[PDB]
Amino acid sequence: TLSAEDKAAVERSKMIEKQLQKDKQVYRATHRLLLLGADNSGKSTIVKQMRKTSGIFETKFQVDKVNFHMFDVGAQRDERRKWIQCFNDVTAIIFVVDSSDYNRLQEALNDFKSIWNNRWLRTISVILFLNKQDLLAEKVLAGSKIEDYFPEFARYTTPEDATPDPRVTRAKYFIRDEFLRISTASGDGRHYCYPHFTCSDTENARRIFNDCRDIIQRMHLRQYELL
Amino acid sequence: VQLVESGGGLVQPGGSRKLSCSASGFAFSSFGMHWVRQAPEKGLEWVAYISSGSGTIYYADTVKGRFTISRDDPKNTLFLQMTSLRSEDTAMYYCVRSIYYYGSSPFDFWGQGTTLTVSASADIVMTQATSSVPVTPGESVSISCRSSKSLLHSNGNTYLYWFLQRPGQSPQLLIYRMSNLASGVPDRFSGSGSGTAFTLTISRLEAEDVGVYYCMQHLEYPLTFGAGTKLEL
Amino acid sequence: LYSLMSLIILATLVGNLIVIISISHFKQLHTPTNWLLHSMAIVDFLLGCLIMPCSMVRTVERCWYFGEILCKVHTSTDIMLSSASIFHLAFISIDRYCAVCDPLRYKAKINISTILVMILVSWSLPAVYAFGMIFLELNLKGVEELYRSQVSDLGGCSPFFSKVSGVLAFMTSFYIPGSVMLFVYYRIYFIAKGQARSINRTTKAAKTLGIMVGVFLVCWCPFFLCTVLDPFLGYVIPPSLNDALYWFGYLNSALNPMVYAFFYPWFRRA
Amino acid sequence: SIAQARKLVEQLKMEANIDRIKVSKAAADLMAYCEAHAKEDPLLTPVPASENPFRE
Amino acid sequence: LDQLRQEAEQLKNQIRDARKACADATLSQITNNIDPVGRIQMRTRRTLRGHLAKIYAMHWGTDSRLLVSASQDGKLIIWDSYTTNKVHAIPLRSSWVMTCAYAPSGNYVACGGLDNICSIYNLKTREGNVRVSRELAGHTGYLSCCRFLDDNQIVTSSGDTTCALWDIETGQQTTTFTGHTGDVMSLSLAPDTRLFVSGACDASAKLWDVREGMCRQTFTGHESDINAICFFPNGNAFATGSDDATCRLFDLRADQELMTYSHDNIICGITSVSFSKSGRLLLAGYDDFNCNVWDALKADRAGVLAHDNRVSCLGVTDDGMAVATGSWDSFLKIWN
Ligand SMILES: NCCc1ccc(-c2cccc(F)c2)cc1
User: Fold this and answer.
1) Which residues of C touch A227 (CB under 8 A)?
2) In terms of CA atoms, which chain C residue is nearest residue A210?
3) Handedness of CA A85, A87, A93, A94 (dihedral sign)
4) Which residues of A touch B106 (CB under 8 A)?
5) Strand locations in C77-145 (E)
6) DSSP structural state of residue C104
7) What is the DSSP code (8-state) at residue C175?
8) Would an 8 Å CB–CB cutoff place D3 in contact with chain E?
9) 3-state SS, one letter per residue, for chain A
10) B55 → closest Cβ in A3, A6, A11
């Protein structure tokens, strides 16, 4: 830099670097979340409750002076094995399942199995939402049986540690145990699952906050050989 | 893109006066700013300079302790503070933009200027060989410039500019770095040189080419202008 | 006796140098915690290089062969550069209290502009307090006649403290940095235990938080415990028991890198 | 779904009738092009550290 | 239904036999006489810092001095590769960007990603700021590549299995290139800007005609997805990199498979490929933190360019002076 114009260029570069430093300081204090689900699931109305062929959406919410960013994947076709690599650094993944059909639940189970066992999604924990519980409650007593769909429903009983009409709880915990046996079939203690019983609610943000705090605490404990 | 200066008037000797340059129409917070003075019957002269982020300021050796520059980015306004006005500060002042990065064109836009009347060494000198030439509307024209030091740098740039102000208007920019043409100027001008001897050529000629042509250097501070070369038709 | 001292000096010099070069050559490890760990390594290297050879030479004999100004300078440098290690250790246990007891705000509070303040406060305060008490007559201006006969009569001179200075040294260089290192790690022990039972039944902290405490409580405690008692006692202590207690403090600086940088997988494989 | 089959067979017919050459000729052409422009490749043959702008 | 399938199978068999007729000798037999170029050392000369998240794409300039890079945080930075100065810094509307391009005349830049939009930015304005001039909408899947033809024409590759040709002045498609099976990943223009190649996840590559807009040729031979495609300087060949740790060379006039660049100690897939100025050296980036250099005429490995994380993009200057490589650790290195 032996000329005046070069000095002015270097000063401009330095100001750009100062702006970049401000941007980095703003960026380092935010948490990114990825939301997945199906068409029948209420993942569309969950966003509205928390609050042109676009390919992605974004929703912002704040709890206890913490910033969260949730990304909903929009107009993309059936298979996702290519663009899933871009999300291998988010805090957690939210999964929404409509447990009021008794027919497409096998498809949801297959989708959950595919997501949980992905190679690029290792070390990311999933928050499992079970939506539309009132529909299940209104449909179980009508008698829409589950033994035909799942032959093992006959040899199942309510677990002792369950903390809840007993048959409604039997159905709920049967679905929950299917999801958790899929989750516990693997994992090696590097990512976890946090199921919930969500209805049409207002405390979903608090549940997400608590689950994220627990996940980060476990990660930090594992880092320092304390766990 | 337009700049307006305000102030001026008649000042008693030894007084003070503050000049203001107001910019509106561009990203004023990214341009350097200069003040350039034109004597009533002489060539142009440089006064001061403030960078984009206010991190660097230069002053002319003629006036260093009496003038003060300041900028206010939120209001998009430039200021000049003058104290103890001598009898030489009786000229017109201009407000000039400047941006510096790889490939930019500094000194591209000039303001309108305001008049100010006062009652009664180690730098490079640039000399214009001829003061006036007669030409014909349709023939070729050539204007030469001279320098006391080699303007060519180690990197490869030769810092020479041509302005060619018209008789009654503010100066504009024709050529920057001795070879590159400006944006909106007709492509019948050209420039060439070797480091100490420079020439400006015009192929055709039209009634709008009448004016005075100037020669400025940008190798190091202070910035020294030329004398001028009027063309009469 | 000399061989073990030379071995300790060599181990300190190699460990601090290797940590300093490793935590600097790699752009991978440019995290603020690593910078704070690098500063402590530099402090330990400085302590090993300068003070330890002269102290070993003085301890091999029974008198010290240099001038009366160098004694002053050496003891003030020893105090200033030995308090910095304890301050740095007390600062390494505060960021881990934010990684586990406040995990959602860890990256927004441990910046690069906070580690700088920590390193400043760690460097400035010990030097100012150890240079403004040794030189400016506050070192021993409670008993001047007894001090000369006890130490300066015929032998290498060492810290001499009065009944008031010995308490301030204890409360400034061993208590405040010590009463905060234990409380934090005792809160963390009740968190890594609850969080580990739910993973197994819907352990490792005992074998990790135990060493980091019992290595610090074995080197400095036997020294600083006897140091404060002598002014309140009748000075009935041989100048041999209070001669090897310096080597415990030296051993702490020798074993600091082996506990804070050679125990985690993110550095062994990188 | 006959439209897809018709389109596929039409595209196959279009791509079936194209002139083709011998592999040895193509290899010779590639070799000739590589040999002809061997003196203008700074990566292939290093340039002395006076003509390049990325020195030091 | 069963009649069209039989005709298609017969046509495919006839095409395969016809191609096999002109197989003749192999490239390795002809080229084995030439002595190898040897062993190559390149030293890193500059390192460019300032990106927050990982780097996805970059593109050189025709002036051989400036370049543009894109990052996951949603930032575009234009560098000065000589003095390492920063000329511009542009913030994006959407942070999930997968590609970027730099105009041949140096007047515009383009980028796009998971928002199904391609954006055009004007670098030369009377005001001293860079602003967006045109948004091109109409695709269904995500954008994966884009290249400039001139100041008014651009070709885009999307994840909805189709390519397209756009008119920037009006913003409406003028041609659509259908025929692939999976989503398309990359494209490469020709020096004369009359043809271009394309690769998709169905393990097939096609040759297109810009003027009249239908597929001219089809190549097969890979076993898995297609990640990056280059195109020979001569204009009669191209190279491909896939997920099965293999590189392929195909000819246009002959329409067969040429020499193969693979080694038994590489398991991960290729992310980017690029040629040298004379076409003698082919160099590709891998997932194992490295970047290998191959002898394009003998399938010999000679040289390694050893980054911290996965290498995502490459680039060779027009005059062959330097090579720039990006990676997922957010550092750009200029080699020589
Ligand atoms: N170098 C080992 C010998 C030694 C160590 C530490 C202290 C000491 C004692 C109280 C306060 C303080 F800051 C420092 C005195 C002597």
Assistant:
1) 192, 195-196, 199, 204-205
2) C104
3) negative
4) 5
5) none
6) G
7) I
8) no
9) CCCHHHHHHHHHHHHHHHHHHHHHHHHCCEEEEEEECCCCCCHHHHHHHHCCCCCEEEEEEEECCEEEEEEEECCCCCCCCCHHHHHCCCCEEEEEEECCCCCCHHHHHHHHHHHHCCCCCCCCEEEEEEECHHHHHHHHCCCCCCCCCCHHHHHCCCCCCCCCCHHHHHHHHHHHHHHHHHHHCCCCCCCCEEEEECCCCCCHHHHHHHHHHHHHHHHHHHHCCCC
10) A11
With contact defined as beta carbons under 8 Å apart, do E84 and A9 qualify?
A: no
The Å distance, Cα C35 to ligand 1 centre, comes to 26
Distance between CA atoms of residues E251 and E237, nearest Å = 5
Spatial neighbors of B224 by CB under 8 A, at least 6 apart, are B46, B123, B124, B125, B126, B216, B217
Using a 10 angstrom Cβ sphere, with 0-12 exposed, 13-18 middle and 19 or more buried, the burial of residue C92 is middle
- Full residue range of the structural domain in which residue C251 is found: 2-268
User: Count of domains in chain D?
Assistant: 1
Q: Mutation test of ligand 1: which of C246, C247, C248, C250 has the most ligand atoms closer than 8 Å to its C-beta?
A: C246
Contact D13, D5 (CB under 8 A): no
Q: Which residues contact D46 (CB under 8 A, 6 or more apart)?
A: none
Helices C221-232 + C241-260 axis angle, to 10: 150
d(CA B126, CA B163): 14
Q: Which domain holds residue D37?
A: 2-54
Q: Could you tell me if the CB of C48 is within 6 A of ligand 1? A: no
Question: Which DSSP category does E235 fall into?
Answer: S
Q: Measuring CA to CA, which residue among B27, B60, B57 is closest to residue B46?
A: B60
Q: How do beta strands E291-295 and E97-102 pair?
A: unpaired
Chain E adjacent subunits, 3+ CB pairs under 8 A? A, B, C, D
Q: Which two tokens stand for residue E196?
A: 């271009």
Which CATH class for the A31-223 domain? alpha beta
Coil/strand/helix, residue B57: strand
Q: Is C27 on the interface with E (CB under 8 A)?
A: yes
The token duo for B164 is 């060619």
Residue B171 burial (CB count, 10 A): 21
Distance from CA of E7 to the nearest CA of A (A): 31
Q: How many other CB atoms sit within 10 Å of the CB of residue E40?
A: 16
Task: Name the residue ranges covered by the structural domains of chain B.
Answer: 1-119, 123-227
Residue from the list C99, C107, C205 with its beta carbon closest to the beta carbon of A28:
C107
Q: Are B89 and B118 in contact (CB under 8 A)?
A: yes
- Chain A residues with CB inside 8 Å of B53's CB? 11, 15
Is the distance from CB of B218 to CB of B159 less than 8 angstroms?
yes
Can you read off the two tokens belonging to residue E53?
């998240």
CB contact under 8 A, B56 and A2: no
The domain total for chain C is 1
| Location of structure tokens 């004379």 | E278
Residue A196 one-letter amino acid = H
A221·C100 Cβ contact <8 A: yes
Q: Give the resolution to one decimal, in Å.
A: 3.1
Query: What's CA D13's distance to the chain center, in Å?
Result: 25
Q: Pocket of ligand 1, candidates C44, C83, C85: which has the most ligand atoms within 8 Å of its Cβ, to mutate?
A: C83
* Method of structure determination: cryo-EM
Say which CATH number the domain at D36 has.
Answer: 4.10.260.10
Contact across the interface for C99 and A189, Cβ inside 8 Å: no
Q: What does the block give as tokens for A154?
A: 């006959």
Q: Do C103 and A216 touch (CB under 8 A)?
A: yes
Cα distance between residue C164 and residue C169, in whole Å: 9
Residue E213 falls in which region: left (phi positive, over 0), alpha (psi -120 to 50) or beta? left
Break chain B down into helix, strand, coil percent, rounded to 5.
Answer: 5, 45, 55
Architecture of the domain whose range is E1-335: 7 Propeller (2.130)
Beta bridge partner(s), residue B145: B198
**Alpha-carbon distance A217 to A192, whole Å?**
13
Token representation of residue B26: 């561009």
